[PDB]
Design a protein around this nucleic acid. Structure first.
Length: 59
RNA sequence: CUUAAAGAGUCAACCCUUUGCUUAUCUUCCCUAUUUAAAUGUUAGCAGCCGCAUAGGCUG
């Protein structure tokens, strides 16, 4: 199994997330938990937010 | 300015063959269709003869 199987059974990602297996592991997990952004080849719609619109990109 | 914006699914074909749904059946008794009454509505628009008339008159 790759990392995707082991992190997703028996609530293992929440176990590393709440640090039952270690706070330095919490760090390792969060070092991979980042927000990378790209808006190309994605839908961009307008949603009314009250007297104006927001360009929502639904992911 | 709508998970906005955009897009060629194309092609091809042997469903075969086989077959016993036969067998025997009581439908059946019953019994009131009874009674009337204008056909009226002129109920016919005819037969000859006087005539050129299929115009018009006469005769019963």
């Amino acid at each position: 199994e790759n990392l995707w199987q082991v992190l997703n059974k028996a609530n293992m990602f929440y176990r590393i997330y709440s640090g039952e297996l270690g706070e330095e592991l919490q760090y390792l997990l969060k070092s991979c938990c980042t927000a990378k952004e790209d808006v190309t080849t994605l839908p961009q719609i307008y949603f009314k937010n009250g007297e104006g619109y927001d360009i929502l990109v639904p992911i």
